[PDB]
Amino acid sequence: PQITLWQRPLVTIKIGGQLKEALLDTGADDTVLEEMSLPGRWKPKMIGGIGGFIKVRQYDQILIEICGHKAIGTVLVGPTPVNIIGRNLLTQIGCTLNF
Amino acid sequence: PQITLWQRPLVTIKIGGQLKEALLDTGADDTVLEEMSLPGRWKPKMIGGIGGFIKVRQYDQILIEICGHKAIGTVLVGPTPVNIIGRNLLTQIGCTLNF
Ligand SMILES: Cc1cccc(C)c1OCC(=O)N[C@@H](Cc1cccc(Br)c1)[C@H](O)C[C@H](CC(C)C)S(=O)(=O)c1ccc(F)cc1
Ligand SMILES: [Cl-]
Ligand SMILES: [Cl-]
Ligand SMILES: [Cl-]
């Protein structure tokens, strides 16, 4: 697809068998989702945004689809204002910025 | 150009005669720069997200050059940790997400 930016680039993702809405965010190094259950062990991580740093849970090698494109990678979970797809998965699905 | 997302998409901008580095951020609704002077009227605004909110000054109808592409739009000024080019100006230079 080709996605313009006159509105938020919100897409449907699938993780854990469930459909969720998420923002394609080239401003984000990593992917962070609202509180949810994921399998396995997690590791601690700090991420910094406009107001400061938050603590999140880091889960590795998690299956996730983005607009139907299947990916496998690191997913962070924590008190994010919105589900964010960051560059770690955007790169996996072959996303680039063009003008 | 086509900009890869293997790395943060930082680009050179020109504003108020100054050259600065800024992040092309599809996740940001608006453009926000570190503390600087700009011409004209302004109004206070709060913007927020991970780590909370910050107070900014909103200036409208500000000319900016992004990778040599001229645009006009609202610029927010305040204690952001990084300069951010948001969708309000990305649209004007014709920037799209593609995969
Ligand atoms: C999710 C994530 C994981 C690891 C590392 C990073 C940087 C990251 O993204 C965090 C995030 O908050 N990114 C911002 C842009 C940003 C902000 C601070 C530092 C860096 Br570096 C990058 C996200 O792309 C844009 C945000 C919004 C997002 C949380 C929906 S925002 O900055 O809060 C914003 C709000 C309103 C505006 F008008 C403009 C910008
Ligand atoms: Cl912890
Ligand atoms: Cl990953
Ligand atoms: Cl604008």
**Domain segments of chain A as ranges:** 1-99
Quick one: tokens of B68?
Answer: 């040599």
Residue B70 to residue B15: CA distance in whole angstroms = 10
Whose CA is closest to B9, among B69, B90, B94, B92?
B90
Resolution in A for the shown PDB structure?
1.7
8 Å CB contact of B25 and A25:
yes
Size of interface A-B (CB pairs under 8 A): 132
Quick one: tokens of A29?
Answer: 């190094």
Whose CA is closest to A88, among A24, A3, A35?
A24
Q: Report the helix count and the strand count for chain A, using DSSP H and E.
A: 1, 9
Ligand nearest to the CA of B84: 1
Quick one: tokens of B67?
Answer: 């990778």
B87 and B38 in contact (C-beta within 8 Å)?
A: no
Residue A93 to residue A87: CA distance in whole angstroms = 10
Number of residues that make up chain B: 99
Q: How far is B96 from chain A (nearest CA, A)?
A: 5
Question: What values do phi and psi take at A64, rounded to 5?
Answer: -150, 135
Q: How many CB atoms within 10 Å of residue B1?
A: 13
Return left, alpha or beta for B89; rule: phi > 0 is left, psi -120 to 50 is alpha, else beta.
alpha
How were these coordinates obtained?
X-ray
8 Å CB contact of A48 and B90:
no
Residues 6+ apart with CB under 8 A from B62: B15, B38, B39, B40, B72, B73, B74, B75
Q: In whole angstroms, how far apart are CA B6 and each of A84, A90, B11, B50?
A: 17, 9, 14, 22
- Using the Cβ of B93 and the Cβ atoms of chain A, whether some distance falls under 8 Å is answered with yes
Residues of B annotated catalytic, as ranges: 25
Residues 6+ apart with CB under 8 A from B7: none
A29 and A74 in contact (C-beta within 8 Å)?
A: no
Q: How many CB atoms within 10 Å of residue A25?
A: 23
Residue B62 to residue B9: CA distance in whole angstroms = 22
Q: In whole angstroms, how far apart are CA A19 and each of A11, A12, A34, A39, B28?
A: 10, 6, 13, 17, 23
Task: Tell me the fold of A1-99.
Answer: Cathepsin D, subunit A; domain 1 (2.40.70)
Longest dimension (CA), chain B: 40
- CA A16 to chain CA centroid, Å, is 14
Q: How many CB atoms within 10 Å of residue A44?
A: 8
For residues A83, B49, B15 and A3, what is the CA-based torsion angle, rounded to 10 degrees? 20
Contact list, B8 vs chain A (CB under 8 Å): 29, 87
Whose CA is closest to A2, among A21, A20, A19, A24?
A24
Q: How far is B40 from chain A (nearest CA, A)?
A: 25
Residue B75 to residue B31: CA distance in whole angstroms = 5
